[PDB]
């Protein structure tokens, strides 16, 4: 469960609206804002004494999230496990 979310947009900067979809420990968050994204966006997590368990550390996807137009919250979207998605606009 390393892949957590996606960024969609055009310029992908603070000039225009962009769509950010991120899963966290208990929910899924969808936001649309004039985000100022990090040079290399990611989520920070740390691990327990045993490698089997982990906890939320910091959120490092963007430096700012101004002029938001949309927000939605629900439950997480997420042998080996195969997950498939289709994204349309």
């Amino acid at each position, epitope marked *: 469960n390393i892949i957590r979310g996606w960024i969609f947009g055009t310029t992908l900067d603070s000039k225009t609206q962009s769509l950010l979809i991120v899963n966290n420990a208990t929910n899924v968050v969808i936001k649309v804002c004039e985000f100022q994204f990090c040079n290399d966006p990611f989520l920070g997590v740390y691990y327990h004494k045993n490698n089997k*368990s982990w906890m939320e550390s910091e959120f490092r996807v963007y430096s700012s999230a101004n002029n938001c137009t949309f927000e939605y919250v629900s439950q997480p979207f997420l042998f080996k496990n195969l997950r498939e998605f289709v994204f349309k606009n």
Partner: antibody, heavy 125, light 105 residues
Framework: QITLKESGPTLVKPTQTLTLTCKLS??????????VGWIRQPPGKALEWLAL???????LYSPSLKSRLTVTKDTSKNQVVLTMTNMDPVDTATYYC?????????????????WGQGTMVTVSS | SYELTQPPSVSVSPGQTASITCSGD??????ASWYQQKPGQSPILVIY???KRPSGIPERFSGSNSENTATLTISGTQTMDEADYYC?????????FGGGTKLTV
């Protein structure tokens, strides 16, 4: 700021059931990552863990007392409730509530970052 | 409950560094935490995950976990630090607490 407070009876007789209520503020009991536990401490003695409840309705109990312990929560009033049945005189102690830090990957408790004030309970005829 | 062993007390002069240790069977396999308590009051978390301070906790506090022994240290111990310190650790999600150590300053 995150705060918790205990309330309930301060005196019960032997062979009676006690209910203690924890009131919380600064956070919602329905928020992910949230949990609350209960601990008791007899006069001059060390802390003894009783039980805890998580936001996902998962629960843990101390195996030495589990048979007499129940923990529930009110999702509307933001409260957590502990029940101890059939108390004996030896169960005289100060009872505490506290917030529980827990790991998300695999259910595993960590530490109590926020504690209440404690309420003294006497068991006596 | 998980077993934790502590000294009954430690004694230092003000301005000196105090150290309280706790031993067990599986401390090297689990994270330890420490709490400070005074009579008539609830305990406060001073150290978690072996060597981390909670916000609001004086910089005097530090700790470690090695050789199945947990440590709490107070650098430049003040008279305000004259309190009972307890060790906690978990084993298979079962809690354990030590007897507590009374620190005299």
């Amino acid at each position: 700021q995150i705060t918790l407070k205990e309330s309930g009876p301060t005196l019960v007789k032997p062979t009676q059931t006690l209910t203690l209520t924890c009131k919380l503020s600064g956070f919602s009991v329905n928020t992910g990552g949230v949990g609350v536990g209960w601990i008791r401490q007899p006069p001059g003695k060390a802390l003894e863990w009783l039980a805890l409840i998580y936001w996902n309705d998962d629960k843990l109990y101390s195996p030495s007392l589990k048979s007499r312990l129940t923990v529930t929560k009110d999702t509307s009033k933001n409260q957590v409730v502990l029940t101890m049945t059939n108390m004996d005189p030896v169960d005289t102690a100060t009872y505490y509530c506290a917030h529980v830090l827990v790991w998300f990957g695999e259910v595993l408790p960590d530490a109590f970052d926020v504690w209440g004030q404690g309420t003294m309970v006497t068991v006596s005829s | 409950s998980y077993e934790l062993t502590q000294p009954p007390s430690v004694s230092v002069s003000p301005g000196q560094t105090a150290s309280i240790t706790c031993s067990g069977d599986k401390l090297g396999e689990t994270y330890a935490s420490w709490y400070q308590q005074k009579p008539g009051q609830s305990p406060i978390l001073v150290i978690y995950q072996d060597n981390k301070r909670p916000s609001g906790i004086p910089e005097r506090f530090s700790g470690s976990n090695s050789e199945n022994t947990a440590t709490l240290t107070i650098s430049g111990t003040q008279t305000m630090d004259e309190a009972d310190y307890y060790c906690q650790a978990w084993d298979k999600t079962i809690a354990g607490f030590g007897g507590g150590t009374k620190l005299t300053v």
